[PDB]
Amino acid sequence: MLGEREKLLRLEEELHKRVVGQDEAIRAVADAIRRARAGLKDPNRPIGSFLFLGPTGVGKTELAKTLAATLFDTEEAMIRIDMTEYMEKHAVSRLIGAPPGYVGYEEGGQLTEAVRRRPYSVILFDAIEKAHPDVFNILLQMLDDGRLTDSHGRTVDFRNTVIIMTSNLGSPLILEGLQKGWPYERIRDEVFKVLQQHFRPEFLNRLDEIVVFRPLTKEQIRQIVEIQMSYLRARLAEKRISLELTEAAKDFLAERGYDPVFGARPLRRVIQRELETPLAQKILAGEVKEGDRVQVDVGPAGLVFAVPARV
């Protein structure tokens, strides 16, 4: 089983193909998946259960998506459950199905139907703190038993799933660290105080790892700018057009595409606005043509484009 073996030993490397930085997080996730596959954990539990803490737009969903791609062959294998829409008493019915004799009994639960049709999946519970107290109890059952009973009586198997829960609760103390000067490993033990105020020990002790994501450096955003324009590069390659960006041009997109609150979330449409918009203009005008090497630098208005003609 060398194929799987090699994927498991080199899981960090595989995940770093798409996820920039967050070294500790990827190590935490890979280590746990390795424990499960080595046969060192309870086989009546999901492969791994994780709590992702830190700011927004820094790699939480990215890692969930990448994990689904390398572990279960596709990004489509990640199931997203947003806990913002599970805040009322009606939430239990949306998650596992309305009880027999109720209006929404036929369609079943959002979580249960998704895992029933895709047992080999990464399940992402975003904003776990916003969830209804009763939804938690179902999630605890699932983390303990590796299974769940829906409103039809059908037992849904979760043993082949990875569970990722995300929270902003860690953010304020993490954003202070290590800005003040806290060590690279004391970040997990310090944030444990905020977690106890919101989560009971039954929950926290059943987690494989509590994972801390940090804000990104300038080099890392630059690397994400490079990944984010892979599709554009490949699209231009069909026309034999290449795109050469100066460090200044990479920095320009990095600064406008990143903010301390939304993280790297605005980046894609910044690239769309600052790069793809004027480039499309240059293609339509006939300045950029089939087979051109296109250089991109910074100007007074934005990004500037040049073709080294007859040199």
Ligand X SMILES: Nc1ncnc2c1ncn2[C@@H]1O[C@H](COP(=O)(O)OP(=O)(O)O)[C@@H](O)[C@H]1O
> Is residue 28 at the binding interface for ligand X, with CB under 6 A as the rule?
no
290, containing H or E segment: none
Q: Per rule CB under 6 A, is residue 58 in the interface with ligand X?
A: yes
153 carries a ligand binding annotation: no
Work out whether the CA dihedral 195, 196, 202, 206 comes out positive or negative: positive
**22 touches ligand X (CB under 6 A):** yes
- The answer on whether 54 is annotated among ligand-binding residues is yes
Q: Which is nearer to ligand X, 33 or 229 (CB)?
A: 229
**265, 278, 306, 307: residue in contact with ligand X (rule CB under 6 A):** 265
Check residue 59 for interaction with ligand X (CB under 6 A): yes
62 belongs to the binding site for ligand X (CB under 6 A) = yes
Q: In 3D, which of 122, 120, 189, 113 has the Cα closest to residue 150?
A: 113
Per CB under 6 A, which region of 17-25, 73-81, 86-94, 246-254 contacts ligand X?
17-25
Angstrom CA distances, 224 to 57, 250, 255, stand at: 12, 10, 12
Q: Which residues ranging from 219 to 248 are in contact with ligand X (CB under 6 A)? A: 224
| First-to-last C-alpha distance (Å) of the chain | 54
**Dihedral sign (CA 282, 286, 288, 289):** positive
70 sits near ligand X (criterion: CB under 6 A): no
Unique residue bearing structure tokens 């997080």: 25
Q: Which stretch binds ligand X (CB under 6 A): 39-47, 176-184, 264-272, 280-288?
A: 264-272
- Which C-beta is closer to ligand X: that of 57 or that of 97? 57
- Best CA proximity match to 243, nearest among 254, 252, 231: 231
Only one of the segments 32-40, 182-190, 262-270, 291-299 lies at the binding site for ligand X (rule: CB under 6 A); that segment is 262-270
Contact 61, 10 (CB under 8 A): no
Q: Which of 47, 51, 61, 209 binds ligand X (CB under 6 A)?
A: 61
HEC letters along 61-108: HHHHHHHHHHHHCCHHHEEEEEHHHCCCCCHHHHHHCCCCCCCCCCCC
Binder among 14, 21, 45, 46 for ligand X (CB under 6 A)? 21
- Near ligand X by CB under 6 A, which window of 108-116, 179-187, 202-210, 263-271? 263-271
At position 78, the amino acid (one-letter code) is: M
Q: Is 39 exposed, middle or buried (0-12, 13-18, 19+ CB in 10 A)?
A: exposed
Q: Which is nearer to ligand X, 5 or 269 (CB)?
A: 269
**Interface pick for ligand X out of 79, 138, 264, 288 (rule CB under 6 A):** 264
Tell me how far apart the alpha carbons of residues 274 and 301 are, in angstroms, rounded to a whole number. 10
In Å, the largest CA–CA distance within the chain is: 77
Task: Pick the piece of the chain touching ligand X (CB under 6 A) from 14-22, 67-75, 81-89, 301-309.
Answer: 14-22
Q: How far is the CB of 128 from ligand X (least distance, A)?
A: 13
Binding site for ligand X (CB under 6 A): 19-22, 56-62, 224, 263-265, 267-268
Q: Which residues are annotated as a binding site for ATP?
A: 54-61
